[PDB]
Amino acid sequence: ASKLRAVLEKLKLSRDDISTAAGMVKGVVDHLLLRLKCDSAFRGVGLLNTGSYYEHVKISAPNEFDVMFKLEVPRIQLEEYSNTRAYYFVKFKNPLSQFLEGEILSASKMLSKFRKIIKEEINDIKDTDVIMKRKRGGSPAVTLLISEKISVDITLALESKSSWPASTQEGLRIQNWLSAKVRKQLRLKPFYLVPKHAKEGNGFQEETWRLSFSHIEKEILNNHGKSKTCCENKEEKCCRKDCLKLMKYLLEQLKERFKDKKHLDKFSSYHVKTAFFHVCTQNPQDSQWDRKDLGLCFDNCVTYFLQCLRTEKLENYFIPEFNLFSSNLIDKRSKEFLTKQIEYERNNEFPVFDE
Ligand SMILES: Cc1oncc1/C(O)=C(\C#N)C(=O)Nc1ncc(S(C)(=O)=O)c(-c2cccc(F)c2)n1
């Protein structure tokens, strides 16, 4: 109650920091898109603004932005990699011919050239401080740092206007919440492939791409009620986004405190975002998200997330047979360790939230 409202107040973004950040990001991004379009392989590239900033669920500071540089590949032919449900080979039924490795459009080759053109172009921005960060972790994105403060993740994304792959057939269970008619409209939209590679033993299948529905996630978060006027009037202010912000802060704070020995490195904000969409499906009515039930609604989010950890099950919201919490990705010790830390916080009314 009083305690969670105080935390939400602290996580609010300053209008002044938003104004300055948005100006700086949009200028660097609009420039790189202009420049990339001069390469014959990237002529049709377009921008999509995605992730927590554009979903209005970014917490603490506007210091991390996400953008997709999307490219329509017509006549695209997909082959699921090794029953992974989320990872695919891309084949054709000319423009990208330089990135072919046999019949296969190589994600690694396309990503290397994308990164190379961006790296060359930022070095000829003279008006503004822009560096590229080192290639770190499993991200499909190239990461920039603007004026030593603002991180920008830019992912290449192939756009397919074809029907979503079969692995999404039982995904996006929004019928009871956002309606069947909305599920149908959303599935008529394109889907994206980003250069995140399937695991292969010690290594990776450097050719493979992964499905992305970041654009659908944004549409859902910014149009998130059963009521079309959800959060447009002081009588319909739900706590859905407040719950997701508090879950993000719970995870960020535990990861910071356990930095000494880094037990929580496999966990990411996308784990709490996925878990949150599942609680939305379970609790489809706006009356299950009344501002006056914030503490209960937060508890619903914490308890589902604890069940996900204990059961080692957290389905991708779009691809049900893709388990983000399988032992292939996160070891059992790491899940039991996060379970123990979140139980403690739940049992002591979230001391990690004091200061
Ligand atoms: C940029 C951008 O714009 N739209 C989407 C988009 C975007 O990042 C993705 C898309 N589509 C995407 O898939 N990112 C992603 N995927 C896997 C992973 S991990 C934890 O490695 O498995 C990560 C990731 C890696 C390190 C830190 C971190 F915080 C996240 N990031």
Ligand SMILES: Nc1ncnc2c1ncn2[C@@H]1O[C@H](COP(=O)(O)OP(=O)(O)OP(=O)(O)O)[C@@H](O)[C@H]1O
């Ligand atoms: N493992 C993943 N699988 C699928 N999509 C992912 C994955 N990780 C990130 N994404 C997509 O990329 C977007 C940007 O990811 P990022 O890590 O920046 O998180 P975010 O949602 O922006 O939240 P924050 O940046 O505040 O932690 C996500 O919102 C999601 O659409």
Ligand SMILES: [Mg+2]
């Ligand atoms: Mg982000």
Ligand SMILES: [Mg+2]
């Ligand atoms: Mg990011």
Ligand SMILES: [Zn+2]
């Ligand atoms: Zn609302």
